[PDB]
Design a protein around this ligand. Sequence first.
Ligand SMILES: N[C@H](CCC(=O)N[C@@H](CS)C(=O)NCC(=O)O)C(=O)O
Ligand SMILES: N[C@H](CCC(=O)N[C@@H](CS)C(=O)NCC(=O)O)C(=O)O
Ligand SMILES: [Ca+2]
Lengths: 186, 190
Amino acid sequence: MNPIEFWFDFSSGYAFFAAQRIEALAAELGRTVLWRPYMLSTPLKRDYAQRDWARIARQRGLTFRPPADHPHVALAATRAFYWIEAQSPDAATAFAQRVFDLYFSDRLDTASPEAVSRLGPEVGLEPEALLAGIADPALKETVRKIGEDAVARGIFGSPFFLVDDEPFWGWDRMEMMAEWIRTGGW
Amino acid sequence: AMNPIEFWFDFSSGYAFFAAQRIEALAAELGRTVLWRPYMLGLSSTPLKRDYAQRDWARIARQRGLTFRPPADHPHVALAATRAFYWIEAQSPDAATAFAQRVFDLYFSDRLDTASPEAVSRLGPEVGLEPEALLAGIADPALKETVRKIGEDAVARGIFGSPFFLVDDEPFWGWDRMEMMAEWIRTGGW
Ligand SMILES: N[C@H](CCC(=O)N[C@@H](CS)C(=O)NCC(=O)O)C(=O)O
Ligand SMILES: N[C@H](CCC(=O)N[C@@H](CS)C(=O)NCC(=O)O)C(=O)O
Ligand SMILES: [Ca+2]
C-alpha cells in the first residue's frame, strides 16, 4: 500500500537495466515494487545511448542485444501485461521480466500480439485467452487510461520511479531513490 | 596540459552548475586536468520535465548544502559570458576557468545576468583583466563567429546536452555520469 512504482516502456534500454535490479533493491530497502508499463532525435545521440547501454552491460556482466529495428512499439506486450495483471499482479511482474529479457536478447517482437501471446503459458495462461484479452475493447480502454493517468500525475520517461510521491527519473537515480527511502528524505 | 577531461556545458544549465562545483576536485583526485568548454548549442511533456528538473536541482542542492537560487526568469541566454570565457582563455586559460567558476557561483545565486556584456565584464578585475578591454573583445565580429563555431563543430562531433564529459575519447553525458566517468579513468576502462 506504499509501493515503489516502476514506470517504464518495454522498449527502454535504461528500463532494462533498472528492471533487473529493482526487485532486489526494494527487498533490501524493505519495500514492494509496482510495475507499470506504459507507452512512449539526433543519430549521434542514439549512437551514444547504444554505447552507454553496451558500456553498462559490459560492466555488470549482462548480455544486451536489442533487435535490429529497435525500439519496437510495445503495444501488444503492454496490453498483455495489464490483461494478466487483472487476474494476478504477480504473474504480471513475472511476464514483464520475461518481456525485457526476451526483447533484449533479440528474441521477441513486443509489437506482435501473436509473438507476445507465446509468453503466456508460462504464467499458466493459454495463448488463446491472452490473445482474446488484448483484443478486448474494455482492456484497450483500461491501458489507455493507465497512461493518461500517468501524464496527469507528472510521470514521463523510462525508467521513472515514484516513492511516497517523490519522483526519480532515470536508471542512474536508483541509488538516490534508495538513499531517500533509507533517510526518509532530505 | 596534454590529455584533459573535456567539460562541455551551458552556463544556464542547473546540472552543469553542480558538475562545476565538483569537477576540478575529482580531476585532481584522479590525477587529470579539466578543459572547460562553454557552448550555446547545449499540451506537451516539457512543463512536466522543466518542473521535475527544478525540483531535482533543489533537492540536490539541499543534500549537499549548496546555494542554488537561479534568476527569477531562468534560464538566461548566456551569450556574453560564453564569449567572455573564450576571450579570457586567449589571454589566460587559468583565468578563464576562474572566470567560469565565478559565473556559475554568481548566476545560480541570482547575482549575474549572463546575457549582459556590461554585467559580465565586471568580473574582469577578479581575474585580472579590465572590463572595457573585455567588452572590446566580445564585441568583435570574428570572435563572435569563432565562439559560435566551437559550439557548432562540437555538435557535429556528437557533443550534445549539458554537462557532457569527454575523457580519452570516451563520452559521458550528464551530471549523473560523473561517477561512472571517475571509474572509467581509475580502471583504465572496460
Ligand atoms: N535512465 C536514465 C535516462 C532514462 C532515459 O532517458 N530513458 C529513455 C528510454 S531508455 C526515456 O526516458 N525515454 C525517452 C523520453 O524521456 O521521452 C539514464 O541513466 O540515462
Ligand atoms: N542527464 C542529465 C542531464 C540532462 C538534462 O535534463 N539536463 C540538460 C541541461 S540542465 C541537458 O543535458 N540537456 C540535454 C539535451 O539537450 O538533450 C543529468 O543527469 O545531468
Ligand atoms: Ca564554486
